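Subject: Interface between my chains keeps coming out wrong

I've been trying for a while to get a sensible model of this assembly. When I model each chain on its own everything looks fine, but I need the whole thing in one frame so I can look at the contacts. Pasting all components below, labels as-is. Any help appreciated, I'm running out of ideas.
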Amino acid sequence: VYAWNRKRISNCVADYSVLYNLAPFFTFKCYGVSPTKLNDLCFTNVYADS
Amino acid sequence: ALGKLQDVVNHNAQALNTLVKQLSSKFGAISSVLNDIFSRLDPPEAEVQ
Amino acid sequence: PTYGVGHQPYRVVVLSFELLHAPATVCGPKKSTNLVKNKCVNFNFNGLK
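Reply #2:
Try treating it as a single job with all components included. I did that and got this:
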C-alpha cells in the first residue's frame, strides 16, 4: 500500500473490455469520464497505480 | 457626417459578435463544447451539464 | 479466508488519464478509416467528434 506500483502506459491501444474477462470487475467508478465510451477517446499519457 | 448611419451598422455588429462570444461561456457547466461533454460523461449525468 | 468480506483483501488499480494539447498515444481498439475530403462526413478525431 505505501509502495503502490506506478507504471506509465504510453504508445498502446487501451482495450478496457479485456479487463472484464481476465479479472472480474466489481463496482467500477470513473471520475471525469463515464464507465463506458472509453474506446473512442485517446488520452496522452496514462498512469496505472496498483 | 455620415455617422448616424454608421452607428446602425456598428451596433448591429456588436449585436452579432457579442452573441457569438456567448457561445464560449460555460454558464456553470464543465465546458462550452457539447461534444466534449457527451464523449466524457454519460447522458444520465450529461443532462444537467 | 474465514473473516468477513469487509476484511478480505482487494486488489485496486487506479488508471489516471491526461488530456493535454499534445499528440495522443493511448486510445481504444477503433479501426481508422480513410480520409475522404470535400464531403460532409462525421469526423471522429482523437478528442473531437
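Reply #3:
Confirming on my end. The two ends of chain B are 50 Å apart (CA to CA).
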